[PDB]
Amino acid sequence: DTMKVINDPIHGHIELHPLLVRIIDTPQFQRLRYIKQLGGGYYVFPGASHNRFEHSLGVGYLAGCLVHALGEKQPELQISERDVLCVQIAGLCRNLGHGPFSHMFDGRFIPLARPEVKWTHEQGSVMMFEHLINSNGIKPVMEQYGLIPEEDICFIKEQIVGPLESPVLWPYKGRPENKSFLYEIVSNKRNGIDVDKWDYFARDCHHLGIQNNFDYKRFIKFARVCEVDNELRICARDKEVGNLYDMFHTRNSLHRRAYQHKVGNIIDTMITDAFLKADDYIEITGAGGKKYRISTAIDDMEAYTKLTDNIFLEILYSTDPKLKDAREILKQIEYRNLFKYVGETQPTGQIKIKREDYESLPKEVASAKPKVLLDVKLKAEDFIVDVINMDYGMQEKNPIDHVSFYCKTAPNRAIRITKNQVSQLLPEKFAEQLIRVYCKKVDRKSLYAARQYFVQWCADRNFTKPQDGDVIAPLITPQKKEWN
Amino acid sequence: TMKVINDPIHGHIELHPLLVRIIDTPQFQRLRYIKQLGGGYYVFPGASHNRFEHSLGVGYLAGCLVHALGEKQPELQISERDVLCVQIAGLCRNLGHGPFSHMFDGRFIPLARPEVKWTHEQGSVMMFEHLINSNGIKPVMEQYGLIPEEDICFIKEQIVGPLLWPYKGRPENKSFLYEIVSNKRNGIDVDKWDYFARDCHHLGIQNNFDYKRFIKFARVCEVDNELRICARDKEVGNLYDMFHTRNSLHRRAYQHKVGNIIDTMITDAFLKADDYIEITGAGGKKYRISTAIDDMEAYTKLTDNIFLEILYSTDPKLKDAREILKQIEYRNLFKYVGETQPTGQIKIKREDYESLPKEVASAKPKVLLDVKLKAEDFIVDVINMDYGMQEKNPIDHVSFYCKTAPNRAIRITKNQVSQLLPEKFAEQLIRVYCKKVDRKSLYAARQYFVQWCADRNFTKPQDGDVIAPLITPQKKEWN
Amino acid sequence: DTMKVINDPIHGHIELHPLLVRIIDTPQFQRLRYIKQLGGGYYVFPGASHNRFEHSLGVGYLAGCLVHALGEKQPELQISERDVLCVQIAGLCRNLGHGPFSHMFDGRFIPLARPEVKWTHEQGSVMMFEHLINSNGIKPVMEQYGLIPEEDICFIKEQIVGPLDSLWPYKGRPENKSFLYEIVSNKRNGIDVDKWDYFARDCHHLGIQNNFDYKRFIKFARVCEVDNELRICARDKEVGNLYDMFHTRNSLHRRAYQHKVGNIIDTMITDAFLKADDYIEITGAGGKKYRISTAIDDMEAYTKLTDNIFLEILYSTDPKLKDAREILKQIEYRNLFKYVGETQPTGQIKIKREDYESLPKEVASAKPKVLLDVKLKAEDFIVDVINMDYGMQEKNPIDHVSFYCKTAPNRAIRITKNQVSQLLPEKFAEQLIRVYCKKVDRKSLYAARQYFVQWCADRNFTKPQDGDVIAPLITPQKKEW
Amino acid sequence: DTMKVINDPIHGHIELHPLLVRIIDTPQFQRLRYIKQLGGGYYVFPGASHNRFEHSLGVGYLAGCLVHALGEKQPELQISERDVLCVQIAGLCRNLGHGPFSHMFDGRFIPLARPEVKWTHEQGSVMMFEHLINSNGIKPVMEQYGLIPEEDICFIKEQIVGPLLWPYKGRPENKSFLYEIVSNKRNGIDVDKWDYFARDCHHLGIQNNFDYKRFIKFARVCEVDNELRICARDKEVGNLYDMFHTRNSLHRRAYQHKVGNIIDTMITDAFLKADDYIEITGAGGKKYRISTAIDDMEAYTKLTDNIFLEILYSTDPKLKDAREILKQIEYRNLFKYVGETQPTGQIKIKREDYESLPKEVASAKPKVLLDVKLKAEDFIVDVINMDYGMQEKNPIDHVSFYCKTAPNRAIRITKNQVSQLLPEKFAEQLIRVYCKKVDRKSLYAARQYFVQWCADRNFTKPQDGDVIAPLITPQKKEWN
Ligand SMILES: Nc1ncnc2c1ncn2[C@H]1C[C@H](O)[C@@H](COP(=O)(O)OP(=O)(O)OP(=O)(O)O)O1
Ligand SMILES: Nc1ncnc2c1ncn2[C@H]1C[C@H](O)[C@@H](COP(=O)(O)OP(=O)(O)OP(=O)(O)O)O1
Ligand SMILES: Nc1ncnc2c1ncn2[C@H]1C[C@H](O)[C@@H](COP(=O)(O)OP(=O)(O)OP(=O)(O)O)O1
Ligand SMILES: Nc1ncnc2c1ncn2[C@H]1C[C@H](O)[C@@H](COP(=O)(O)OP(=O)(O)OP(=O)(O)O)O1
Ligand SMILES: [Mg+2]
Ligand SMILES: [Mg+2]
């Protein structure tokens, strides 16, 4: 019928076009109300109760703001109402594929449960989106508002997941090269500067109790479309380059303080463990009454629709003896009897730990031979080793090298700015790894032992000296001259 | 040692290790799965907050106030023991909340167990006792200098009131300690201060009451042979504003017409599921949603999860309950028709609520209608709005002191403050909704409703002339 | 010339059309950087350092937001870019007439210095605006952007001061654009963008939280026909929010704008200005010299009249300015006139402006019947009378608001108080009376308290809140108390 | 005298001890109400109307919060009420020496007006403090609250300016940590920064990412090389790096905004041209100039942002030139920014050379056709030192930490134990060039000289170099 207004604490009163309202009011979308944005983060930051639902609204809203701003300043781009709606829909829908506790599901659980599969929430989102459209008769409604479902559905999916085919050249079918800038708004594959980040910076900061340093409204006011290598791309004003570096700094701060908090991560790990032990016994009904498992619900969207943070409580409140082991792990979370953090270290020089080796790392720590008297001996299964990749979104690459700028005196001429033209106080590297070790045996003597193994292992591998190394393992740290 | 927790409202809060022990139990952690505002989240998408974080905030603020009083007035002899008991009461006053908070004890239990008299306060005391006993907390209390017999009694009394000086947990010289967590005299307590700031932060509305200011100006003075908390005289304006803010929040958010109808629909689903959902309590015995309040072990497991258990069920027995919840997901909600109030001296009684849909359906609007509606097509929601004390002004039950005589308590009347304040402190709103959502039904529903208002002499609905132009002229009182 | 972006802490990044930039970059406008929004309030709330300049930008911005919103939702209104600019200009320029310390100047100083004259900041704003336009060659620039100076200047002035009888009293725009006159300074009911900026700005600086959401209001606003005018109508649902908006305004007055100490500091500054008024010279047009009290007669002199006068007096060495300087120095040492107490007239009693001068005499004429060391005279008392209302004297402004319903968006309606709530005020205006004493020693203050409470008893005013404590021998004689 | 409560938008309701109230209610302190925190920043960020007065209150408050926190957690430090009050007084009083438009005065005006003198706001503050105490009979009042004026006044001054082997006389080595609260000379981590981060962010419309309340909760005193120092929890090292990053951001975006700086420069110019004619009465009726008022505190007391308006509203023909410059600010006819570059070479341009830089730019010989020829006096060259507060040094190397398992044992954490994503350098210089000739042809020319000069000196390629000077940038192969 007409627009709805929604009050969001981050963006204020947001207007939603009636087509967007139709998409929102479906089981597939409403599911996001039962998925925590930050997963296990809520168990450390009690303000982080927010869910993927409200984040999706914000992304949809901001995507609209940017495409409206570009059209208003540059009418010659011929941005249509159709374009605007398609960008908003992609914005709303890019989080549809998230599973229970968000990054826990595709970052920890699926890789362990279905190692062979290559699953990302992005692929999930496209499949969920297709299911949403077809199950709810949205195509007719799209037609009613001037959309062309064949080309526009393709455009929406491409915004979320990138080109759906091998092109080998313009690889996209939803829109031509003169509308290339539209693909940079929701999920920016070139440099990661998109409206998804801008919403979560402000939303997560508001809920976590941390203040956000990046100003997205400012960026929107200064954004322009310019020709770059025969594409029309979004360009930023030159003098905003400092702010872009700060945006990635902020992202990295948020990961350090919150998203990769050592305890938040161990809770995610414990929940994943419970899910693995429950995976043979939980049944989720999908299409035609068929039953799926937590690990196979990703193969049927009807089942996946019903896969939310509810699984946690279904296990916790179960009485089935088959779920006893899964239930016991979750109960340990309630009593705060967590696996204990031992410490953190990093590889030095060039060392980079591969995913294929993650499984062997607890074995290595347990194989260390600290020269200290120990009452207890620990085994591989008593250790957890978490490897964390921290970067500016593009592996070792500087994403600001993939941004186009313009100057005040020549607004149509795109230019490049190098790091050395900005500041000497910027990072010289853009990627790193952290290694955390935890112990499943929580008593005083086990933990003392775990610390000696860990510090010995760091010494043997030539990793960095843990910050508290001299205090937790005063007999071990002297043997390493590099640390003294 | 102490844990530090980062709360978005209060910042970094320090928690004494005994509080940490109480928090890290199934009975307390349960509050992570209970939305503060129930169905409000379905209208204000920022309101994702749960009872858990609110409880921390209350416990913190209760500590702030008692610490402040002890610091300024050492002669009160506030002990570390007192402080901890007030913080524990603060942490634990929300323990008795059920699924979707006020939906559960405000709508569901009254309909499901009309004979019973249940409040979340009573729930909290029972849950607290169960928490203590199930988790071996008494020894730990002893270890930090608490005396469980007296102090458990003190804590419960802070939450629910007395189970002469009617209290056993502390004597009259510590009377002021009973005003911090749940203030039975006038409702000015740290529970409100936390939810004002927390709800505002999540709802996207700005809070006008400054509790830090209040804490700086609070003193204990003798009032009728009790030591009570007294506010500085100048602060009386801020107190009126505190209640105004509360009433605003209810108007805009807690009693939002759609939030309420969603709570109503969820309640309906729970009623239809109540025969079939089984909750295991003590000794393996099975309970229903409506009887889980009789066993704390079962109640521990009763959270917002029930909603999703019903929604995702495949059992044909749960078909009807599941259908209602699915209507919520598609946003096929019962439609709001309008709102009115009783005029003059009319007050609608709880005993009459059930007859009201019948009355609306019996109205005979003189207009041509395609469809005829029945009682079962109408929902009538009666909402009591007040300043927390029925028709009473709660500021009449506050004690103040002046700068020139800080130990002398005084009273301030409404007329000494402002003529721009309310003359009444309680009122009723009547909302009507229609279960039939099509265009013709809605048209008809509007004519019935306005006719009914006219017949009953209720206030003219705001949009009355637009929704029912043939009906409103017949009433001269309305023009 | 292109658009400038400006970062405001309240509104974020605001875009300004180049014509607005031209108006801003003049002595007449830049003057507002040197005038405190809240006058003496800064001496009580140290966060309130903000000036009229930034407030004006905000008003100009919000006026643009609203007129843009209306044009986007209802293209049939035929709002032109010309209309938008004229509304923004009126928004920017409605504060131009403010004098030193804002409301101190026209609320206290001018009435005392020039009792014969009838001056308001609104009239000041129109005169300043005219002077700004003419002194800076703005008329040609206006023509360059499609404005028609004859009509549009008239329109801008009318937005600020109202019509310069009749169904339609305005000349700048016709009745089909009536809704444009409701944006910047709403004479019908006071619901305008000026309030929305200062609620959010003052709250941000004072450390108080604002409960009115103007962005919400903009989203729900529509233009409808009302009595053959096109007016702005609010959605029916929003009527509660409008009552709250006036409650918030009254809260802010109670807590901040009429703070008892902020007011006494304004009074002291006014006193210093009065004592300096013979000696301070301000050069206006053609080199003529003016006084602080006559600078309002020449805009060139008025342009140079800012909070700077305060410091010019404070730092003076001239013996002629000794008395003015001593008062201000008492402010620095915080040796202020002492607050005695506050009371109200009962029920429906109102004091009027003509009587204000006789009030110190009355207090001094009270005969307490308590033993006193010192006797006080009329000149030792200050009596401040404060009118608190919902912006329209005894009237309910919500009675002058038009609403619309969801089911009939083009049909305007009225909503009465009884259709909203029984918990609303039954009265919309009241007076406070504050008494202060210029003699600050312990014995004088004790005496002042007895006179004051006796006077309250004699006049049948309300019992001061601390009456029993400050005057325990006086309050028993009144059984009603 | 009892405690006063004051409502600050940043900190909320702050309680002030009556002795602090007595210090605040003096001409010497109240003067800070008339001095903008950010100077010419207000002319770019209209929210930045805040003055030094409210910042001083915030610093005094936070200094009290921290010393109270330390005493409460570690009674064995023997912090007295006397210690607390002295730290709060230093906190309140460290801004007393600021002149008109804050950093404009001692960063630009005094160096140009009195090149021979060595003046800082810190020295100003100690002299103002002494004058405040003596003019207002504060010593007796101090005694009344348990202070010992001889030792405590010395302590307060030392906290502000440093020492006038253990070099301090106000307190012994076991109270070393008290000298780290208000102006931390060891590493710059102090409560002054925390207040201005939050205050400036609130007014500028930028959000602050350092949490000082968190830091206070985790701070401890530990023994380090026979001194008792403040130590941070090991975990918090990341937050400290972020604190300095925030400081640098704020300088980049706001404190050193290219236009805010040019406005300060123009105001400085006007002050220079007014300095012979403005008279400020000091002690015994002696007259001082703006540039000599720093020699007499009675005169300096009266030296505030008011000078700006006294000049602007003057009618004296002698002040005509000063008045014209300020009027150009009102009409926004500013000196025009030409561009920004940095040295590539490791030697910092020295303060002694600043004067010769306009001459160098004017001596560049761009190979381009130019209508107009520019002279040295048409160029302004502003050299800006950006660092982490300690020249080339990493201030986190001068921070002590402690671990959860051994809270009294201080440790060091090196940059490599924290992250590879941190800066490799901690100091740099920016060079901004502006032109006093604002017409289109002069500005075109200025751009060619500037880029040519960058090329000749081997400075970095200006960001817009290829657009402003397309004929000049190709000649430098390094720039591609
Ligand atoms: N008074 C208020 N102040 C702030 N937010 C509000 C207020 N009232 C409602 N909201 C929020 C809740 C929603 O997120 C959003 C829309 O609510 P509302 O405008 O009441 O829509 P609605 O759909 O209930 O009304 P209708 O369909 O009658 O327009 O604004
Ligand atoms: N850098 C940060 N900024 C703001 N809040 C943070 C930061 N790091 C953690 N928090 C939040 C999460 C928690 O709510 C609270 C306590 O976290 P933290 O200090 O990490 O406790 P911890 O228990 O993990 O550390 P430990 O047990 O080692 O002392 O602060
Ligand atoms: N990095 C920033 N972050 C937030 N606000 C900023 C930043 N830089 C400047 N501001 C503020 C200050 C001003 O109020 C407003 C305009 O500043 P800026 O965009 O620098 O314009 P400018 O006129 O100085 O540059 P130009 O004229 O080159 O476009 O934004
Ligand atoms: N109602 C309020 N809410 C928030 N801040 C306020 C309020 N009233 C005053 N303030 C601010 C202004 C000052 O910064 C600070 C103290 O003001 P106030 O309490 O009025 O003290 P006062 O000195 O005027 O009263 P007194 O001496 O009578 O105790 O609080
Ligand atoms: Mg609706
Ligand atoms: Mg911990």
Ligand SMILES: [Mg+2]
């Ligand atoms: Mg006072």
